Design an enzyme around this catalytic site. Structure first.
Site, short mmCIF file in Angstrom:
data_model
loop_
_atom_site.label_atom_id
_atom_site.label_comp_id
_atom_site.label_asym_id
_atom_site.label_seq_id
_atom_site.Cartn_x
_atom_site.Cartn_y
_atom_site.Cartn_z
N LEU A 223 0.91 -1.05 -0.02
CA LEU A 223 -0.04 -0.23 0.10
C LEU A 223 0.73 1.09 0.06
O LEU A 223 1.95 1.38 0.51
CB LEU A 223 -0.97 0.07 1.23
CG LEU A 223 -2.39 0.05 0.98
CD1 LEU A 223 -3.27 -0.18 2.04
CD2 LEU A 223 -2.89 0.99 0.10
N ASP A 224 0.32 2.50 -0.53
CA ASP A 224 1.30 3.50 -0.64
C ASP A 224 1.57 4.09 0.86
O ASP A 224 0.52 4.02 1.51
CB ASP A 224 0.33 4.45 -1.77
CG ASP A 224 1.18 5.71 -1.93
OD1 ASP A 224 2.43 5.57 -1.86
OD2 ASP A 224 0.60 6.66 -2.66
#
Ligand SMILES: CCCCCCCCCCCCCCCCCC(=O)OC[C@H](COP(=O)(O)OCCN)OC(=O)CCCCCCCCCCCCCCCCC
Ligand SMILES: CCCCCCCCCCCCCCCCCC(=O)OC[C@H](COP(=O)(O)OCCN)OC(=O)CCCCCCCCCCCCCCCCC
Ligand SMILES: CCCCCCCCCCCCCCCCCC(=O)OC[C@H](COP(=O)(O)OCCN)OC(=O)CCCCCCCCCCCCCCCCC
Ligand SMILES: CCCCCCCCCCCCCCCCCC(=O)OC[C@H](COP(=O)(O)OCCN)OC(=O)CCCCCCCCCCCCCCCCC
Ligand SMILES: CCCCCCCCCCCCCCCCCC(=O)OC[C@H](COP(=O)(O)OCCN)OC(=O)CCCCCCCCCCCCCCCCC
Ligand SMILES: CCCCCCCCCCCCCCCCCC(=O)OC[C@H](COP(=O)(O)OCCN)OC(=O)CCCCCCCCCCCCCCCCC
Ligand SMILES: CCCCCCCCCCCCCCCCCC(=O)OC[C@H](COP(=O)(O)OCCN)OC(=O)CCCCCCCCCCCCCCCCC
Ligand SMILES: CCCCCCCCCCCC(=O)OC[C@H](COP(=O)(O)OCC[N+](C)(C)C)OC(=O)CCCCCCCCCCC
Ligand SMILES: CCCCCCCCCCCC(=O)OC[C@H](COP(=O)(O)OCC[N+](C)(C)C)OC(=O)CCCCCCCCCCC
Ligand SMILES: *C(=O)CCCCCCCCCCCCC
Ligand SMILES: [Zn+2]
Lengths: 124, 88, 64, 128, 171, 165, 122, 459, 71, 174
Positions: free
Chosen positions: B42-43
């Site tokens: 995930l970012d």
């Protein structure tokens, strides 16, 4: 950085930045949470003036000079306007509301001796 | 205060119940151990939005110096557990 | 029972102490308690002296 | 462009809007790191005594002692009579005393005339 | 210090709080949160290391002009309405050593369990000092944080006050 | 309760040998009373909730209801009961132009209408322009940020450098 | 105050000064002026302890109203007619003093025309 | 006054002939008995003072100061028990001897009818006071504090001796009763300006007058607890008492000679209050607080009005109980953390709940909360000075604001806030310490009920 | 404290009510309007006006005793 | 009686007779019948018991009377024995005169409360006396100072008398 050697008794005491104690990382685990100091840290010459209960130097959203202009302007204009309103009162169209018996002479502490010049008010 | 005490398992239900409405993670893949960089990638900026959701959920707000060290749905319960004195 | 106990020790007993203090000690000295003399309206009789104050003059009043 | 923030002694410059945090030179990284070094050496020394169970008292703080010693007992031996101290001392020490003398002398001289001549009202004045 | 990565995260973190303070209504916050979210992705892929700093400074300066004068603060943070509200009810643990025996006898079970911890800390103290000195540079420590417990039985050095600190809601 | 005291004051203020600017300021203030009252109702009662998910919105504690109720009764009948018993001690003004008798009511209602419109305008998705009038009122006129930061600095600084050292 | 715009943004000589209300000559001008009589001469007013400002000319009405309140207790809703009578009596006094305002204002307007004639005669 | 002098002397044999472990018990009990009998001095008449003999007399100004003096010795004995614990037996009994000999001189000083007998006993108090400071103080600065305390007083006392002898040669007597009937007005001449200065500067150094006070922050800081209590409760009132007596023979020259000393006090009253806002030492903070209050007494005495003297007498008694109480409070903290820095031990209200109640009451009296006798005395001086010059309300109003600022800043710094983590030896409050504070505050508040016995001869 | 109906704090949902809250709350809301309307009806002078304001423009120079312009 | 009625005058009280018009009862009237039965009467019983005890063993205290002595004007200079008695007598009279001003002030304050809203007129005899005594008190004792004495009082009077005889003498030459 020692204080300037102007002969005011500062000596070789460090000149720390003139920053309040409210301007420190509130989350860092301080040895003195209320003071926001660290054991063994050189204390500012004016530490007792920069405690959280006193002078604060945190950055403000509005620049210092701009705040002074606004507050004085509001105070200055308001006082001038009150003076204008004082010399130009607003009074409804009426007369000198009358009172009897020489304008309540005896009721207003009038001296019975040396009776006043009679004053009377006529119907209308 | 009358506010019900927070149980160790009760926190975990809330933590995942918030991650399950993100609409950017697979509900069947996110578990108690699901890293946001090494497991499902995930970012990093999503961590800011993830933590903000946590803070808006529990009331209290996590510091940014320690929010950046938490991408593990299990760790959030651990961090909140060690911040509201929950032991059972 | 709870109210009667409170209404006795905290109301009745103090008003006996206060009244005894006021009636026999405070009021035995000049001007300790000074009342405002009651207002006297036209056409009234005095309990003490029995005087009667004549009513006011006929009113040239009107309806409404 | 938005107006630049203007600092002051009572309003410090925000750290974000300061052209000194972003620059990363060779001196800054080895300087901001050094501050954390001594800062950690002191904390280690403090931590040893703080957590010690065979201790009951006050941990002497040399920084605190130096703070008070420079504020009370070291000021005079580091004082030199020069053009600043003499002028600053004169108008702060002798200034106010002289100023308040002529204020009260003028006020009471003015009052005395009005009382001798009877022009000051003291009808009910029987307390002083 | 803060890494350039950390600064952007903090700048993004705060910009939404102040932005949330302007919208109040949730739906109007979502609409602009995405827009502000997008403006980061516009320059996110940049990898110059010299123009990103320029945008960040322009980003920080832009944030200051529009920042809310009165941002919302959670009521337990540095500035909230209940920050340190319960600091007066928090009392050290050594205060119990000065209790009178009569009032100590009111809790026969509690104080027996306390004596164990004093024994536990007293026994563990010697090992903790030995661990710190050996696992620390010759010239002295370089940062905060202490080593964890290596062998079984040994407890993390310098644990007493962190473990036995007063509760956050004493009463 | 409030009508028997507040309204009877605007009547006397309007029809008195007063200061025009002071008379104007009071009327503007009365309208401002409606605006921040509507601020409380709108943001605390209407719209959709903004509070966290897990809350205990409970109101059935008997003490809370009883304490509020008595003042709630008092808040409605206090003015009528008091004003009809206290002996007269002045000459209240009851005759005056139409636009002065009801000036108290029109301004407050007018402020009520103005407040309601401005409150709803925040629902639209149009952006905002930080105004100096907004920051001036938000920061209490800057008075608590100049005086409380200037006067302590001057006095305390003089104590150490001048008075003591 | 509509008249204020005249006195402050118009002519000051025509408008009368509230603190300098007519110093004009005595009853002369209005044939057979009738003196305003009083009911509570000296002792009735100084027996109900009326305020120094209330007992102007409606004392008989105010004294009568205060009589009802003492007896009507606790029927504080009673005496409504008595209060209405005093309100009306005060109202007539308010207009009567109000008439003097317009009476002098036109007298002021009349008084200037004669002066204008003499200045404009030559 | 022999009925009080002889009992005080007998305390000395009592201390030395008592059991080695009962010196503190016998001394405390019998000095308290001497205090109880001091209430007999209140046989005061409206027209004539109480004249015992050719050497001693008592009036409404002497009585409150005598009763205060004899009530302070038992309190000093309780406060000295702790730190005089490891001291050897012989030196402990010498310490008590100094305290008794100090009370012996004080009671004879406040009752001497002749003004040279007053001088001898007034000066005799230096010797025991100097010995307590320089022999039983803790710091290295007690030696230099003793020298400052000694030579400041004598520089003013020696001219006073010449002035008094000159008055006897001219007037023929120094009996205070005689001077009341043989006093003659003072002519305006250069010789009479220096006669005025000699008669007053001796008492200005002990109040102290602003400018001549640098010994007070040194003596009151380096002295033992008993030294600070008597120094700031009775010894400052020797000068104020001296002025009230000797101003009888200085009229009308006091009309214009008082101007320089009224401006030093009025402006110095604001410099000393301000200095308290930044003092880093809790004991030195209370010392400067004494200069501010005694500046009001100087102004009250120099304007010579019935209201000023009534206020001056009330202020002197009120300050003695309130200032001695504050020193005891600051001492209790010191006896635990053994340091005087004010910012060292914080949040003490969390650990010592009752001792913080004494802190609150002490500060309320310090900032003159009505209806305390602290407020009654200060108010009367403010009323009197308004008649003197209405502008003085400005200076006496500003000092009120600053007085409440440093009184409550001291309370907040040490009682409120958060406790220091590494200070872990704050044991509970002993009954000795709690009783010490209750013997200061209870009489201070009781006097509010019948405050006419501390208003002086002009009541 | 008090009686303690002890309504469980529900998760995302509308909080539970009781029969006493609404009936009493609604009782006073109707009381306010009943009191407001009842007083407005009987004496509306206090809120709109007591006596008509006599316009001085619509008067005559005779009742005011103005001497004629012709002397 | 307790206090002499002449020293503290009080005009006769006139309580207007009640004249109810409403049909409702007066709550105060019933309370007056409940207060005078559960408060006034029980308190009177205790007092009568206490009063009886006092009458059994009555004993008296007298008001000390001071023989007159020569005033300061009759004393030789620097004669302490004669100046002592004269000075003490002056001090006693100063105390008495202080209380006289308190008697007059007490009467003046009572009139203002008793007369109610008409105090500004009905209180004319008291105010005249209050201004009368205060003027006399001010001349006798004022501006003397804390160390006041008979000698300073005598000197002040001689200052006033000289300035009066001079004024009277030169008035005829106007
Ligand atoms: C109406 C009331 C409006 C307030 C007006 C008072 C404003 C006072 C003021 O602006 O002075 C602040 C003064 C400025 O100096 P500063 O720039 O902050 O310090 C050097 C850094 N360049 O900074 C200071 O505080 C110095 C003392 C100023 C004395 C005035
Ligand atoms: C009033 C007098 C004002 C005098 C101001 C001018 C003094 C001056 O310029 O020189 C003073 C002298 C320093 O010499 P200077 O030529 O200035 O150059 C530096 C060389 N050291 O410095 C000296 O060493 C001479 C001593 C200076 C004068 C000392 C006395 C006045 C100044 C101190 C004020 C004392 C305050 C007392 C407060 C009492 C009331 C509370
Ligand atoms: C008129 C004056 C009347 C008061 C007379 C003076 C009062 C004396 C105060 C009391 C003295 C005292 O402290 O009593 C102590 C005494 C017990 O002390 P002690 O016997 O010495 O204990 C160790 C024995 N091995 O206690 C007792 O023995 C009392 C039983
Ligand atoms: C009424 C108005 C009253 C105003 C009072 C003004 C102040 C009065 C004087 C205060 C004296 C201050 C205390 C003495 C100073 C001191 O503490 O000593 C400092 C200094 C150190 O010397 P020392 O101690 O011997 O050696 C070092 C040991 N570590 O000591 C020295 O080096 C020398 C010490 C000098 C001796 C002290 C003199 C005391 C004052 C009397 C002066 C004599 C009169 C003048 C002589 C005649 C005129 C020529
Ligand atoms: C700091 C420096 C301070 C310097 C102070 C210097 C003071 C010395 C000069 C004063 C001399 C006073 C004097 O000698 O007066 C003479 C006078 C003679 O007596 P007589 O004959 O009665 O006068 C009538 C004449 N037609 O005698 C008299 O009548 C009155 C004598 C009174 C005694 C005066 C005592 C000396 C003055 C002390 C001043 C206080 C200074 C304190 C600081 C000291 C250091
Ligand atoms: C740090 C040291 C602190 C201790 C300082 C010791 C005290 C200072 C010494 C004071 C000396 C006495 C002052 C008088 C000197 C002799 C001259 C004199 O007495 O003249 C009297 C003069 C008579 O004329 P006249 O004014 O008309 O009298 C009626 C007025 N109502 O009447 C008058 O003019 C009244 C008196 C005038 C004096 C004015 C003083 C103004 C300054 C006040 C501040 C004092 C500063 C002290 C210096 C500190 C350094
Ligand atoms: C900073 C320096 C400020 C001090 C300046 C004092 C000026 C003295 C003066 O000129 O009089 C001011 C004031 C006016 O009052 P007034 O009744 O007109 O008497 C005339 C006296 N010149 O004279 C007075 O009557 C004193 C009034 C005192 C008002 C106290 C208000 C306190 C506010 C803080
Ligand atoms: C009969 C007499 C006249 C009656 C009419 C009332 C007067 C006119 C004003 C009504 C509008 C109003 O007060 O607006 C109220 C608005 C509402 O908050 P907002 O900032 O718009 O939204 C807040 C939320 N945001 C930020 C998300 C949009 O706040 C303001 O205006 C803010 C400025 C207040 C100061 C301006 C008045 C004082 C001027 C003097 C110098 C400061
Ligand atoms: C013939 C004439 C000679 C000259 C005059 C002398 C008179 C006094 C004689 C004292 C003799 C003595 O020994 O006194 C001693 C005795 C008491 O014993 P203590 O040792 O003080 O006990 C003191 C207590 N300790 C020992 C524990 C410290 O004191 C008296 O009784 C008085
Ligand atoms: C005269 O005394 C009027 C005083 C009232 C001041 C408020 C005026 C407000 C005018 C607004 C316009 C309304 C026109 C009907
Ligand atoms: Zn100790």
């Amino acid at each position: 950085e020692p204080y300037p050697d102007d002969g005011t008794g500062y000596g070789d005491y460090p000149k720390l930045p003139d920053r309040s104690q409210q301007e420190r990382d509130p989350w860092y685990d301080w040895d003195h949470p209320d003071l926001r100091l660290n054991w063994g840290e050189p204390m500012h010459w004016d530490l007792d003036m920069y405690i959280r209960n006193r002078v604060d130097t945190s950055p403000t959203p509005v620049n210092w000079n701009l705040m002074c202009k606004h507050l004085f302007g509001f105070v200055a204009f308001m006082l001038f306007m009150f003076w204008v309103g004082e010399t130009y009162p607003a009074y409804q169209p009426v007369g000198p509301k009358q009172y009897p018996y020489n304008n309540l002479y005896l009721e207003r502490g009038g001296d019975p001796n040396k009776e006043p010049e009679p004053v009377v008010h006529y119907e209308i | 205060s009358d506010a019900p005490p927070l149980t160790l398992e009760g926190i975990k239900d809330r933590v995942l119940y918030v991650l399950k409405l993100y609409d950017k993670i697979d509900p069947e893949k996110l578990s108690v151990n699901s890293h946001f960089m090494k497991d499902l990638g995930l970012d990093s900026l999503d961590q800011v939005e993830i933590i903000m959701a946590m803070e808006d959920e529990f009331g209290f707000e996590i510091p940014d110096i320690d929010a950046e060290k938490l991408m593990c749905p299990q760790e959030i319960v651990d961090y909140i557990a060690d911040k509201k004195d929950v032991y059972e | 029972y709870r109210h009667s106990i409170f209404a006795f020790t905290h109301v009745l007993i103090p008003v006996w102490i206060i009244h005894y203090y006021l009636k026999y000690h405070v009021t035995t000295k000049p001007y300790t308690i000074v009342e405002k003399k009651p207002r006297i309206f036209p056409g009234d009789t005095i309990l003490e002296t029995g005087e009667v104050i004549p009513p006011m003059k006929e009113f040239p009043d009107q309806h409404h | 462009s938005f107006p630049k923030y203007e600092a002051s002694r009572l309003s410090s410059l925000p750290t974000t809007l300061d052209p000194a945090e972003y620059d990363i030179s060779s001196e800054t990284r080895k300087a901001q790191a050094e501050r954390l070094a001594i800062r950690s050496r002191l904390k280690r020394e403090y931590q040893l005594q703080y957590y010690d169970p065979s201790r009951r008292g006050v941990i002497e703080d040399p920084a605190l002692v130096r703070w008070t010693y420079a504020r009370s007992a070291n000021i005079y031996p580091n004082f030199r009579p020069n053009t600043k101290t003499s002028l600053l001392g004169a108008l702060f020490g002798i200034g106010p005393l002289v100023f308040w003398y002529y204020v009260f002398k003028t006020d009471r001289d003015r009052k005395e005339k009005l009382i001798q001549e009877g022009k000051l009202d003291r009808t009910f004045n029987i307390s002083y | 210090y803060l890494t350039h990565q950390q600064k952007v995260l903090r700048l993004y973190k705060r910009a939404l709080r102040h932005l949330e303070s302007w919208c109040i209504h949730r739906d109007k916050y979502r609409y602009f949160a995405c827009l502000l979210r997008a403006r980061f992705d516009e320059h996110k892929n940049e990898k110059d290391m010299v123009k990103a700093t320029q945008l960040l400074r322009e980003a920080e300066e832009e944030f200051w002009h529009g920042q809310h004068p009165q941002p919302y603060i959670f009521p337990e943070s540095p500035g909230g309405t209940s920050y340190e509200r319960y600091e007066c009810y928090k009392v050290p643990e050594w205060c119990l050593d000065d209790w009178h025996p009569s009032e100590k006898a009111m809790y026969p079970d509690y104080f027996a369990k306390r004596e164990q911890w004093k024994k536990l800390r007293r026994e563990s103290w010697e090992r903790e000092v030995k661990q710190l000195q050996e696992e620390t540079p010759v010239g002295g420590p370089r940062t905060e944080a202490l080593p964890p417990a290596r062998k079984q039985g040994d407890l993390p050095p310098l644990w007493w006050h962190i473990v036995t600190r007063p509760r956050e809601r004493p009463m | 309760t409030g009508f028997y005291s507040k309204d009877l004051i605007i009547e006397a203020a309007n029809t008195s040998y007063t200061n025009a600017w002071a008379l104007l300021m009071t009327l503007i203030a009365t309208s401002f009373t409606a605006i921040y009252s509507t601020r409380i109702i709108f943001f605390a009662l209407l719209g959709q909730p903004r509070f966290p998910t897990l809350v205990n919105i409970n109101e059935n504690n008997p003490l809370l209801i009883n304490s509020i109720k008595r003042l709630l009764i008092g808040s409605l009948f206090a003015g009528y009961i008091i004003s009809n018993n206290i002996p007269p001690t002045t000459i209240p003004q009851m005759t005056m132009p139409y636009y002065l008798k009801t000036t108290a009511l029109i301004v407050t209602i007018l402020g009520f209408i103005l407040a309601l419109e401005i409150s709803n305008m925040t629902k639209n998705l149009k952006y905002h322009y930080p105004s100096n009038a907004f920051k001036f009122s938000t920061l209490l006129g800057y008075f608590p940020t100049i005086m409380h930061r200037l006067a302590p600095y001057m006095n305390l600084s003089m104590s150490q450098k001048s008075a003591s050292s | 105050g509509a008249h204020l715009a005249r006195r402050y943004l118009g002519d000051a000589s025509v408008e009368p000064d509230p603190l300098r209300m007519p110093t004009f000559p005595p009853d002369y001008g209005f044939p057979e002026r009738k003196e305003r009589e009083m009911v509570a001469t000296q002792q009735e007013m100084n027996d109900a302890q009326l305020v120094l400002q209330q007992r102007d000319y409606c004392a008989h009405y105010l004294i009568r109203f205060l009589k009802c309140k003492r007896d009507s207790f606790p029927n504080f809703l009673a005496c409504k007619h008595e209060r209405h009578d005093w309100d009306y009596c005060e109202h007539l006094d308010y207009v009567k003093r109000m008439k003097e305002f317009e009476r002098e204002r036109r007298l002021l307007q009349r008084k200037k025309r004669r002066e204008q004639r003499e200045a404009d005669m030559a | 006054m022999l009925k009080y002098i002889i009992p005080t002397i007998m305390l000395m044999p009592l201390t030395w002939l008592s059991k080695n472990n009962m010196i503190w018990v016998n001394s405390t009990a019998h000095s308290l008995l001497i205090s109880f009998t001091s209430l007999l001095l209140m046989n005061q008449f409206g027209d004539n003072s109480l004249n015992f003999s050719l050497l001693f007399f008592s009036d409404s100004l002497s009585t409150p100061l005598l009763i205060l003096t004899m009530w302070l010795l038992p309190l000093m004995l309780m406060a000295s028990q702790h730190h005089l614990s490891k001291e050897n037996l012989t030196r402990k009994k010498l310490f008590i001897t100094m305290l008794i000999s100090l009370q012996l001189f004080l009671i004879m000083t406040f009752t001497a009818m002749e003004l040279i007998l007053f001088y001898i006993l007034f000066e005799a108090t230096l010797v025991p006071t100097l010995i307590i400071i320089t022999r039983w103080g803790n710091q290295t600065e007690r030696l230099n504090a003793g020298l400052y305390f000694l030579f400041y007083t004598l520089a003013g006392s020696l001219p006073l001796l010449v002035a008094l002898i000159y008055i006897q040669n001219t007037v023929g007597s120094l009996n205070f009763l005689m001077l009341q009937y043989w006093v003659q007005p003072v002519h305006n001449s250069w010789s009479n300006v220096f006669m005025w200065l000699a008669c007053m500067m001796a008492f200005m150094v002990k109040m102290p007058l602003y400018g001549l006070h640098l010994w007070l922050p040194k003596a009151h800081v380096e002295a033992p607890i008993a030294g600070s209590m008597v120094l700031a409760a009775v010894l400052l009132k020797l000068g104020g008492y001296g002025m009230l007596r000797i101003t009888l023979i200085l009229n009308p020259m006091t009309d214009f000679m008082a101007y320089p000393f009224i401006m030093l006090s009025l402006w110095g009253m604001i410099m000393t209050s301000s200095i308290c806002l930044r003092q880093t030492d809790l004991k030195s903070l209370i010392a400067y607080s004494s200069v501010s209050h005694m500046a009001l007494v100087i102004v009250a005495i120099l304007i010579q009005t019935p209201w000023s003297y009534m206020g001056a007498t009330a202020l002197m008694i009120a300050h003695g109980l309130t200032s001695s109480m504050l020193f005891c409070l600051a001492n209790s903290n010191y006896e635990r953390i053994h340091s005087r820095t004010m910012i060292l031990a914080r949040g003490l209200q969390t650990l010592l709940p009752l001792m913080a109640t004494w802190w609150l009451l002490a500060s309320l009296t310090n900032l003159a909360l009505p209806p305390t006798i602290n407020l009654i005395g200060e108010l009367f001086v403010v009323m009197s000075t308004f008649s003197w010059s209405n502008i003085t309300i400005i200076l006496m109003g500003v000092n009120m604001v600053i007085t409440a600022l440093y009184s409550l800043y001291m309370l907040i710094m040490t009682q409120r806030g958060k406790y220091t983590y590494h200070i872990n030896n704050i044991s509970p409050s002993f009954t000795r310490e709690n009783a010490l504070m209750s013997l200061h505050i209870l009489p201070l508040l009781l006097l509010t009920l019948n405050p006419k016995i501390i208003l002086g001869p002009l009541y | 404290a008090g009686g303690g109906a002890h309504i469980e704090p529900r998760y995302r949902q509308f909080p539970q009510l009781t029969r006493s809250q609404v009936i009493q709350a609604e009782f006073f809301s109707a009381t306010m309007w009943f009191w407001i309307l009842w007083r407005f009806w009987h004496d509306s002078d206090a809120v709109l006006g007591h006596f008509p304001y006599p316009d001085p423009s619509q008067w005559t120079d005779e009742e005011l005793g103005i001497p004629p312009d012709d002397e | 009686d307790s206090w002499d009625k002449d020293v503290y005058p009080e005009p006769p009280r006139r309580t207007p007779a009640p004249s109810p018009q409403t049909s409702l009862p007066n709550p105060i009237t019933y309370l007056t019948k409940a207060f005078d039965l559960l408060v006034d009467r029980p308190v009177t019983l205790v007092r009568e018991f206490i009063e009886r005890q006092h009458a059994k063993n009555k004993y008296y205290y007298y008001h000390r009377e001071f023989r007159r002595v020569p005033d300061i004007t009759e004393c030789q200079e620097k004669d302490v024995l004669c100046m002592f008695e004269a000075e003490m007598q002056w001090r006693r009279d100063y105390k008495v005169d202080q209380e006289i001003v308190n008697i007059i002030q007490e009467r003046l304050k009572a009139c203002q409360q008793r007369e109610g809203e008409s105090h500004r007129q009905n209180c004319a005899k008291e105010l005249e006396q209050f201004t009368q005594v205060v003027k006399a008190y001010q001349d006798r004792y004022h501006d003397l100072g804390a160390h006041y004495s008979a000698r300073k009082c005598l000197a002040k009077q001689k200052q006033r008398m000289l300035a009066e005889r001079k004024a009277a003498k030169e008035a005829a030459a106007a």
